Amino acid sequence: VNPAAHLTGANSSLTGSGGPLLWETQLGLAFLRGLSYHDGALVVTKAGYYYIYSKVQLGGVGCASTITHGLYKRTPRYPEELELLVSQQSPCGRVWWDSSFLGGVVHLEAGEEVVVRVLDERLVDYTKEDRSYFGAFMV
Amino acid sequence: VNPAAHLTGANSSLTGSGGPLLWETQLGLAFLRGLSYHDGALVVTKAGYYYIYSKVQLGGVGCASTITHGLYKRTPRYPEELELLVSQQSPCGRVWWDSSFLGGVVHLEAGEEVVVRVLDERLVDYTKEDRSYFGAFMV
Amino acid sequence: VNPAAHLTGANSSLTGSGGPLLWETQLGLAFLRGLSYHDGALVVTKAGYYYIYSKVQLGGVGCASTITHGLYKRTPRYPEELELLVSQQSPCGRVWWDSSFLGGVVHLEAGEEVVVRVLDERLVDYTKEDRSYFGAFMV
Amino acid sequence: VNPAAHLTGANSSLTGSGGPLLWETQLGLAFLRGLSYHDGALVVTKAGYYYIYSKVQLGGVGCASTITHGLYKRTPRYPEELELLVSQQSPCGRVWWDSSFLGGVVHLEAGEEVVVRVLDERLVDYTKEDRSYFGAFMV
Amino acid sequence: VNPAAHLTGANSSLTGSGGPLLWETQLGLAFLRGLSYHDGALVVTKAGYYYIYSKVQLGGVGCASTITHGLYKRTPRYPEELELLVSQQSPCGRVWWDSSFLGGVVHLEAGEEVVVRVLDERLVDYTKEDRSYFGAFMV
Amino acid sequence: VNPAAHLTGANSSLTGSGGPLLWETQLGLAFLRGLSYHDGALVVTKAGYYYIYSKVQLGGVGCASTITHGLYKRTPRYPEELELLVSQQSPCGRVWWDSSFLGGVVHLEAGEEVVVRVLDERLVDYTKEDRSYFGAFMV
Amino acid sequence: TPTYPWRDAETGERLVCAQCPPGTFVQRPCRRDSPTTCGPCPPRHYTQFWNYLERCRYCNVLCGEREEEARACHATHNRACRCRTGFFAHAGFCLEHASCPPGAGVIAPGTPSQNTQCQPCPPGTFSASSSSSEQCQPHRNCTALGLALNVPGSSSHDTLCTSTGHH
Amino acid sequence: ETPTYPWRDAETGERLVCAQCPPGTFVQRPCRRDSPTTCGPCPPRHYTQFWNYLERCRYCNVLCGEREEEARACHATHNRACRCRTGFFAHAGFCLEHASCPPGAGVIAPGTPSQNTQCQPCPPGTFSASSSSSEQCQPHRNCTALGLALNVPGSSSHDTLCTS
Amino acid sequence: ETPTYPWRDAETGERLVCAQCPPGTFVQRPCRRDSPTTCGPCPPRHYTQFWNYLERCRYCNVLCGEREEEARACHATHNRACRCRTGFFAHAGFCLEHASCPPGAGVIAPGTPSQNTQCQPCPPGTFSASSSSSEQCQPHRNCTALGLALNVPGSSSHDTLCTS
Amino acid sequence: TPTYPWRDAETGERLVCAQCPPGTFVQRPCRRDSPTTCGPCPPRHYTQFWNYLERCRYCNVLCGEREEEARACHATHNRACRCRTGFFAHAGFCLEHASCPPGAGVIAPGTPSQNTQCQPCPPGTFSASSSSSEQCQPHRNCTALGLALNVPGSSSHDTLCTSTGHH
Amino acid sequence: TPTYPWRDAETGERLVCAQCPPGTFVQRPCRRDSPTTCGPCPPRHYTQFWNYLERCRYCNVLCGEREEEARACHATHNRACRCRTGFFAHAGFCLEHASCPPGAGVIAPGTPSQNTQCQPCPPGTFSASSSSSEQCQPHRNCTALGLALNVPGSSSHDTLCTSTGHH
Amino acid sequence: ETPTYPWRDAETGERLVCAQCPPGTFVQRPCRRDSPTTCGPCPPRHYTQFWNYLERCRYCNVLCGEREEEARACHATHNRACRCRTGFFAHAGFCLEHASCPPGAGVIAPGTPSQNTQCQPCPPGTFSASSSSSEQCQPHRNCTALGLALNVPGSSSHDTLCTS
Ligand SMILES: *[C@@H]1O[C@H](CO)[C@@H](O[C@@H]2O[C@H](CO)[C@@H](O[C@@H]3O[C@H](CO)[C@@H](O)[C@H](O[C@H]4O[C@H](CO)[C@@H](O)[C@H](O)[C@@H]4O)[C@@H]3O)[C@H](O)[C@H]2NC(C)=O)[C@H](O)[C@H]1NC(C)=O
Ligand SMILES: *[C@@H]1O[C@H](CO)[C@@H](O[C@@H]2O[C@H](CO)[C@@H](O[C@@H]3O[C@H](CO)[C@@H](O)[C@H](O[C@H]4O[C@H](CO)[C@@H](O)[C@H](O)[C@@H]4O)[C@@H]3O)[C@H](O)[C@H]2NC(C)=O)[C@H](O)[C@H]1NC(C)=O
Ligand SMILES: *[C@@H]1O[C@H](CO)[C@@H](O[C@@H]2O[C@H](CO)[C@@H](O)[C@H](O)[C@H]2NC(C)=O)[C@H](O)[C@H]1NC(C)=O
Ligand SMILES: *[C@@H]1O[C@H](CO)[C@@H](O[C@@H]2O[C@H](CO)[C@@H](O)[C@H](O)[C@H]2NC(C)=O)[C@H](O)[C@H]1NC(C)=O
Ligand SMILES: *[C@@H]1O[C@H](CO)[C@@H](O[C@@H]2O[C@H](CO)[C@@H](O)[C@H](O)[C@H]2NC(C)=O)[C@H](O)[C@H]1NC(C)=O
Ligand SMILES: [Mg+2]
Ligand SMILES: [Mg+2]
Ligand SMILES: [Mg+2]
Ligand SMILES: [Mg+2]
Ligand SMILES: [Mg+2]
Ligand SMILES: [Mg+2]
Fold first, then answer.
1. How many folded domains does chain A comprise?
2. Disulphide bridges in this chain (chains G, J, K)?
């Protein structure tokens, strides 16, 4: 069975703490198959190369004119997050909408984790499960 | 044999009806392998989790300042399309170009379909097979 | 063993020659598994359908207001590159940042190659391995 | 009695002939005192230096994005207008409004005339007598 | 002696009552010579035609995005102000600065007054006597 | 004879010394009548109140994004210029054009002078006599 | 009856003259032996208040090409203007009523005062067109028709049914 | 009557015509040779709005933002729906604050959940002195109705004053 | 002469040097021990522009938009190519309408498929009265050439009038 | 010969005086016994038409730093200006001729009247450079050279051949 | 001592009068028998240089609502203004000091002359907050505390440790 | 003392508590029954900044751009870091040229690697004649200090002249 997951924006997604986004893992389009989840992280149980992705729908009113959207690894072997795939966008150039998508193949051991962070978080629309999400699959 | 497809923008792509985009399925870079196509829909024949994607090249002159690009499921079990992966973009902020990409893993049964819709459709450049497309593969 | 690769932006990435970007293939997040690399090209050794992708982080100061980012095939059977997946973006609409992502499934024979090109090249930020990259995997 | 006049925008003001603007000379705020009027022109009957002035209220919806507002002399001695006081404004940088004001001292002989021209004329708001006008007094 | 005056922006200039601007009449550059002043108004004591003028220095941070700058007559014969010379400007198209200037000849009787109003008044820079002002002289 | 003058933009007009603008005094529309001129300054020979005015045609390509246009008094009694009438404009908000106009009544003694300064001076279009100018008349 | 002060020219005596009502102006001031003569305002002029003007005000409100009279110039009031059919007023302009695109429908039509209002079509309804009159309409209802579902609808396209049941 | 759906019996293989399930329900178990379709009620946070033969109800996936309240709750037969809270209007997917009419202009229509404040310049004989999202143009104080004389003429932005 | 390509014979394994196929063709079958490369003609909607050894011709994948017409058709040896239709010019991947020279300015060059209208302000003694994408600056009516006297001086935007 | 009316000052008789041709002005009006004396316009002044000016017009067209004379001030005409080499005229300015970037080439060079024109290099051609003179050039043609194809070219890079055939 | 020329009115003799120092103005010019009388500038007026003004200059620098006096109007100088606490000067305005968002921290606080300066938190440090005082602070250091690592930190969140070691 | 990490011995399966490796090192080989953790030094282009048990050092993946120089080199214990070169300041991820104070304004603070030039309008009695990113407002030449008379009053953009 090939690990896969797709996690969706949820009412709890934006903590305001500067930490990772949280996600839904079972309702509507969300699911886990051969991966786990823990406090915002996808937790890997089978080691290998994974294609990881995330899309965030961004939006706001006028204008931290720069948004960073990224996927980061956590390993117990080092006490700081490691960057995997990051984008910077300045879409504030009244109402605007932009969506940021990231995907890429990374190596992950059992027990390592992946998270998503956006700065600033508040520009993320979490109100719709089809518009912000985070997933992966083994390749 | 692992299902896959990549379908491309075609001269017939923009119906003007408010329905789904249509696509080419055999010429140039388009193909089907273990999936089918019917009036704009990829039709699934083997049940499972698929990574689905689509990219549309958008462009126009000045400025419905908001574009929605999405992938939607159709099932005979419910009489309305279901949203899978959607983006909203306001790129009109004279000549402009922007491209919107969507990808994500979804569960699809045999007999279900996936389509793409863009509103407004008219901003989609269908004149180049490398710039608007829709595909999938089983994961 | 399923072919995969993920190649990253490097100090040598922007040749200025109008040719393809170059990439790192072994340090930090870069790797090759069952694919090769030669002067900017991923070189295929096992024939099949591949999902190919690339992300480039773009940025600059004010304002060739149009950027083209694409993935192109090279085959010994034809003396010109073939377009696979291309985007055009006009993000110059002082400091700005935008990221362009492309992905899609294509058929590649043994011995064929894939490259990335951006015009104009100079707007690509190659200084961070997490922000510009090029990879693939067989599907 | 020291010659003076103040002429106001009228319903006839925009001929669309490429000729000068026309003006009201009697109703509301408009008057002539020791100057005459004929077909858009202030006609001088007493020779001397005059301060001439004109204000035009300009306005438009989005967008020759350049507006020229000028006062010009006609003399029977020479078969072409002479430019006196001219402004160029590019105010189109949705609904916008801008006022252009011109004033200055010129020497005028009896039998010479002064006219106002705007290019493009149709951006002139002629609907309010307090907003677009043309006058003079001897100094 | 030919009536004239030049009144300057003052610390009291913006009442915020929706009434007219107030002005300094004695200090620095301000003076009255054969005209009077009461509560924001130039008061006419000698009947005749006057060239009246006013300049307001406007400025703001980003953004009724439309500014109206006008001169108005009050007469005891009628219980409402009469518009004389009015400009509408939409200069907000970050820090911005713009000057609005009005001038024109009007007939005024003894006992009539002239006031200046700006909407919105708070965009008026009243801090420099050389920048916002109101005056007149008989012609 | 009532003092008046109108001076026009000339080829010498922009010294680039940070000193005042220079002006033509005899050719085309320029004249002096009961006022003098020396090194950019209108020189007063008869004491009284004058309406002074100046218009500068400004223009540029894209972009101190703030332009200051002013009239200043020099007197032998005090070793610094006095500001009379000053405007600040931020018109740079590609090719743009804007006109700045200043007028007002000031008291001047014999032997006092008036000069015009623009910062930044190089945005002044001095090529057309009808477009940038400086004058005065006694009131 | 509001008044104003005056002086008889023959005697110098102080007078108290009647002002003149809306629609009129002082054609002749009072005298010791007659009241103020109030003239009716001529065409293109008005007085809206009691007054002692010697000339009525000018009806200076002119209607643009995208406007029409909401009120005519009358002796009692100035003319006034509103946007013509198809246009609404904004920032002293008359703009074209927007269209609601496919996927969305009209919830209030445009007026001279406001622009078309629009919502995204809710579930079960659609609008296929860019229109400034078309509302979100309910999808064709295959079950109510006793027909099979052929293609599900969306917010911008109607549901399609076949032409028969299933058996 | 009740709409239907074709179904190949698993282990019979005959073409059955089964009853679909009604809004508020979903198919717990398909129809067989002898048994009708078994329909179950949508659990909380889920719905079906139409007849259907879903094996699980759709998820109530509309979430209200901080500027928004429920116009409808999540029910067995419909998803949640949201409208802009008091003081805001729905524009391009967002909830914007109701605008204010400056001095010189009056409210001709209150802001609602779908509509910004509507404003017009105060017509002659009327006034508004403040920036407000409620205050309408009011007629000038009428000095002759109160039996007083005129002190200071009013404007589109100031009331007429009368002398005591 | 004819360009070539190396090829490992399937079932011989020797290195052959085969003839490539010419523009308008593709390789139906590779060269063997005794047989030359077999070249076939590109079917409709397909092309090869260079010598090649493609197993299938490239697809003619250039499509003209509504503002565009074919400058070249899809041929066996080249792809389709498009230019802007009459009244438009090619700018940044789009087809824009030719601009108009306002009154006061005249056309100094017609718009073409690659070029916008070119305009200049009417020099002295010349005029243009209308916004037009054809009309050039014309010299003023010359009153003395017609034997008439001057009525109204002309401008950069109005013709000189002469009195009868 | 166009004329203007005048009066003899000694007699009061009506006169019909000749106007003055391009390049001249009326230095002295006609008299009963002499024609109008037409003076030649001094430096920096012109008359372009028949006229009865008493002073010629001033040559007031000044050339900016990015411009040069297309025509000198002459007694018959005012000065006129055009953009210097490397610049084109737009909106009363003189702008730098654009460069066509890599992937695209010049199809018309810039002039004082127009900007550089550019196209995307068609199939078989390339431009490697950002340039306001470089055109799309045909790819190096390996088959014509009898050499093997090493790396295929693109619209912004030339095809590379090896240095020998295949055999 | 700088001077100016004058004339005695009784005799017509030429005089050489003293100018007047900063803080004063010429209230009365010199005479043959007395020096110039220099008056002190009244409130709201100044002279900053030696001068022979007959009235001092007006202190015309007014402070806006976001400003306060850097110097008072004095007889020797005009008033001058600076941005109040929390604001910096830019383009003749007083703007709010920016905040450094999460992920970044203050390296210089704002002043009346400059805006807050900000950097992205370097490795090992964090800022969790949007703040115009908060600096990048070092992550909680699990090894120095003898505690196990629970969740690694980032540039915008602190490292979490458990409450015990591993053994 | 030395921080640690749990580890299941491969082939014993007991829970060991191993020493982590220090900054500048990584784990060449894990701790066993009898042997301590074996730590190796980071090779060039690699680092570890904290105690760790990485099997390979992190890559020094910060690259300086053409506007930038190394503030720190890649070391065994830290990544490279970059700052803006002389003449530039760090704004929103970019290196912008230091701005110039126009005539009428003077430098009140030099530009640095983190900070743009700071400018103010020249206060009374002071001047700046040029656009410069160094030049401050200077006091006017004082004619009375030099024993001269006034020739031309100065401004915020021109020096006072005195007569010889
Ligand atoms: C095709 O037509 C059929 C009719 O033959 C139709 O089915 C109907 O659907 C509606 C919409 O879901 C149903 O209305 C509901 O009825 C139930 C009770 O059985 C109510 O509980 C529902 O909830 C209301 O409750 C809220 C309070 O909490 C209200 O405030 C709110 O207004 C809710 O709507 C609801 O009214 C109706 O039951 C069926 N009718 C039948 C006979 O099944 C179907 O919708 C049509 N299809 C399409 C695609 O348009
Ligand atoms: C390397 O050089 C070789 C020459 O030794 C070269 O091959 C040549 O290519 C061109 C371009 O494809 C060929 O030109 C074509 O010739 C055929 C007939 O054989 C024509 O039918 C073609 O069509 C024309 O038809 C249209 C009308 O419908 C015309 O309007 C239009 O202009 C078309 O071009 C076309 O002319 C030519 O045949 C070959 N020559 C040989 C000997 O093979 C090759 O292109 C060069 N390689 C590179 C990479 O530049
Ligand atoms: C102000 O108040 C008075 C009455 O209370 C109004 O005066 C009347 O005006 C109308 C309009 O022409 C006349 O027909 C009446 O005869 C007047 N009556 C009196 C007693 O004066 C007046 O119109 C009011 N003004 C406004 C603008 O509403
Ligand atoms: C208008 O028409 C007349 C002739 O048909 C022109 O007059 C001539 O002007 C030239 C230029 O100096 C002289 O050399 C001729 O001798 C004139 N001849 C006559 C008969 O008048 C005139 O130049 C024309 N004007 C313009 C601007 O073209
Ligand atoms: C210019 O130079 C002179 C002295 O070298 C200054 O004159 C002095 O001014 C102060 C200020 O009021 C007095 O207290 C002194 O008594 C003056 N002395 C002399 C000898 O004149 C003057 O202030 C300087 N000006 C400026 C602006 O710095
Ligand atoms: Mg619609
Ligand atoms: Mg109001
Ligand atoms: Mg024209
Ligand atoms: Mg090029
Ligand atoms: Mg912070
Ligand atoms: Mg300076």
1. 1
2. 17-30, 20-38, 41-56, 59-73, 63-81, 83-94, 100-118, 121-136, 142-161
